[model samples]
Target: SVRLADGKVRNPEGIEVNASLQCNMRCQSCAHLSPLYRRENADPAEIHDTLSVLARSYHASYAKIMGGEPLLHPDVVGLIEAVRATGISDTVLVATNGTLLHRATERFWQAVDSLEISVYPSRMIAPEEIERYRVLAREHGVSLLVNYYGHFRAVYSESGTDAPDLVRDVFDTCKLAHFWNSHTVYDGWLYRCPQSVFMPRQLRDGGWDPRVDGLRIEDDPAFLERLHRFLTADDPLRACRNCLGSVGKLHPHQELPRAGWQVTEQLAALVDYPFLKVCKDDITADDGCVERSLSAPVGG
Candidate 1:
């Protein structure tokens, strides 16, 4: 299932939905990447409808409901049920910051096959570590472990010093989720790659359309052949490359790229530093979308 992307083909299990794009932590490189919501797909219900087509047309063995902090969504369970109705089973998964895992219900506990937590190292997390997270996972009979903790430094934003042209520096980035959702953002404007691509052409004209500003709740028409080719083919990402390295952008799990369900802090490079040149490119100007650049320690 883990093969290179062929951008022109519709890839299977290519869509991961984040329930709460809003997050509580400001990790240098959290998945939603940035907090800006102006470009976010306005209708969650529409996303679900589009996905109904996606689930049927593609090999979406599983659909993941995740986000900056997914637990924040009031209808998280309902969202999962929407995915279940699409009839793709077993592959439905969830990843969270772990601070909220203990808050899930026994029914919510039954729906998920596995859960991964961002093990942000802090005194606050020690409580979850000692009793809350692992305890809940064990209680629910689900595989639970801290799996995707990360960090970053803001170099391009107004709050930081000028470190312009940071996107090309070649840092280790996490997109392991590319196995699901082809990885999209800004209301699914960008076609391929999950690391958050914010191109203007995509922002203005692309992205699957449900036509209205409200959630679709039901199936809308789809163009599967068009999407499959995009998912299987390599989607642009070099321009959106993010940190996944100790010195460069790195995700905790990338310390050992193949490790399942754990976010450890060991250093390992997932993508060749030079190959990134081909898949990534960005617009010189902003187009009301926000995909941020967070720094990873270089030579640390």
Candidate 2:
């Protein structure tokens, strides 16, 4: 693992597994483009196979089980076990919207090492409900995290930017992909970030190809070397042309009507472009400015 000047590890923070692609909420700017997807859940057997292949040469600190909503999966507990069986990740974490915490069985709590509930402004979990989970987490010995999200960052463009320099800048300055290493494993492929995994589904007309953007998980003598080169490569992903990464304009969180959730040219026009300008120095400084600056709304 390579450590950057900012004291951040470069190999990967962890691997994220999309246990389900069907979401209950239709956020207008969902980073995973979940609103555009049909009902889908990852097969536990397939997940085990995929991670086992990657485990031959690579390992991560944790395996995050997430989705349009992880708890939505019928066999999410089994899915957590499958990820742990591979032994590729040290711990298993489940990320959910907390709307379905009541559905989780004791087995679910026992299987996971950590549980993260994303509290969206539109569907905030009540304090009493959170207290219930806090007690359950203590009983099951699971770490609980409640993330209150007041805003969301725009992720995609209806018509991708034609400027090469802008795409390069977005990719280089992206904290989620380049710095945080939000590596994802889906359908026998390893993507550098969640956007890379879902962008092809929504941005087919934007010249984005998953084959070129993700590494295939397979048995190969040079697999590790290939993964290292792929992870360390300076070239931006083809999806970067259409993706804003983590630098998009901040907007107050709100649920969109089902028909209005998909990105369109009209919707894209509403987005205030280039909300941030990041250079090499901003990243090297390792200060809180980059994050703090994003807290203010666009045009504030």
Candidate 3:
């Protein structure tokens, strides 16, 4: 196994097997699980094939399969099967919103080594639905791990949600210390941990391959190489570090460091094209700000 220069484990593909996306929920806070990164991927079978090839070539230990809702994939069970067959069964996880697992199959539960469910306090599994699902998951012989992150405080609720409070509530049920997870966000470009998309691309504009750092979706080795360097290593201007700082808000030890951070003209221009979209429950259908800032709504 070759170690990445950035001090993190690198795979033959130089990616953490944050496998097949395509989820089901439209969680208010789901950067991808809702609207941002949940775009269609290459055929899931072919994706599994690529992952299989990468694992054969190098170390591909665990895979974290997520999307807007991976469960919605008609062949999700088959996808899990394909992943397990790759000899990396020990760490195949599916990031879910906990809404559709109510319809999950017994074999699906059995095949999935773990479930990383991100629950928002605002929706279906509010305080009431939280306990119900957690208990249900435990009963089914599937390990239940849940984490909470706050919304953008947009128009979802009448009053803004307390980020700290929502996170505390999740811990109250179970610290899930054993279930601590590190995530990768697809960035709709390359692979990142979701929050990194908020970083300004204009900042990375001068690099050898900054333009395509995180956006290329093809399995081409060259594009993948550039993406590997960008994601695994930190460059100047603290872009990756700042993205991590934003992510720290979801944890108990961190406090809100910056708010209403501005974007560069490049990022502002990109948002106008159609990448991120906001769809909170209570917001007016035509709220101008989110529209001007992100992509237009899908079904509005």
Candidate 4:
């Protein structure tokens, strides 16, 4: 087990299954561009197939059921169970925006270890609402956490692979990769990282991204070799160029227009984003950050 930046030991193999491509709220710096793109639920059979091949390929340490908003998918709970069934990842989790916990059934909370809720300013979840969620967690024996990772607006001039000498340092020191270096599985394809998975959608239909003809779930002997090279290669990726290569705050209404989703009013009336947060202490190494037990107000 190698040590991560957090100074704890964990298996290097981590997997993230982007369960769905639909999100409720539109954040300024949506990594998956969930707000900008159209929405769709992940197919359960395809998801199972993807996991089956991956489990046979390697033993992963952790699994995350993430998405535009995993809760939006009708079978999000079932998907978590599917991940658990693989027996590959020791810890399974779900990440959410915390706007739909009220709609969750008790069975949903019991599926995984912890819930990491991203606290956003726009969604004004009342204290009573949060309290209700807390009650559900207590009853279901699930850990409920209010998560906040100061948002960043990643703006990049060029892909990391093509960038000249100096900026290469920026890519090397990139926190985006540092925190979530885990590979992502979306629509049956395995990518090196989340940026690799979603950056293509941000580009024009034929916009140039990484050429990943060899990265898939195939059983070819050469495929595994190419994957190893892809993972350990010293060369930077093209997505790094599109990314500012680091985390930066999102200026109000920076990526899209203000008219689409104003700060408040009827727009925030319905919350569709995933509000499920599951904690996996058995496999999740403590990153040594301040731990808060209270759920912060949506914009507070």
Could you tell me every candidate's TM-score relative to the true structure?
A: 0.57, 0.87, 0.50, 0.73
Model 2 C-alpha lDDT per residue in residues 65-125, reported as the tens digit of each score:
9979888898998999999999888889898989999878878878988888888878878
TM-score pick, better of 3 and 4: 4
- Please give the lDDT score at residue 174 for candidate 1: 22
Lowest-sum lDDT 10-residue window in model 4? 272-281
| Overall local distance difference test of candidate 2 | 0.76
Residue 46 of model 4: what lDDT? 76
As a whole number from 0 to 100, the lDDT of residue 107 in candidate 2 is 89
Q: TM-score for model 2?
A: 0.87
Lowest summed lDDT over 10 consecutive residues: which window, candidate 1?
Answer: 153-162
Model 4 misplaced regions, further than 4 Å:
1-13, 149-151, 155-162, 209-214, 222-225, 249-300
* Local distance difference test values of all predictions, in order: 0.44, 0.76, 0.41, 0.58
User: Candidate 4 at 156: error in angstroms?
Assistant: 5.1
Which has the higher lDDT value, candidate number 1 or candidate number 2?
2
Candidate 1's C-alpha lDDT? 0.44
Which candidate number has the best lDDT? 2
Cα lDDT of model 4 overall?
A: 0.58
By TM-score, the candidates rank as 2, 4, 1, 3
Report lDDT (Cα) of residue 13, candidate 4. 50
Write candidate 4's Cα lDDT for 108-136 as tens digits. 87886666676665675676777777777
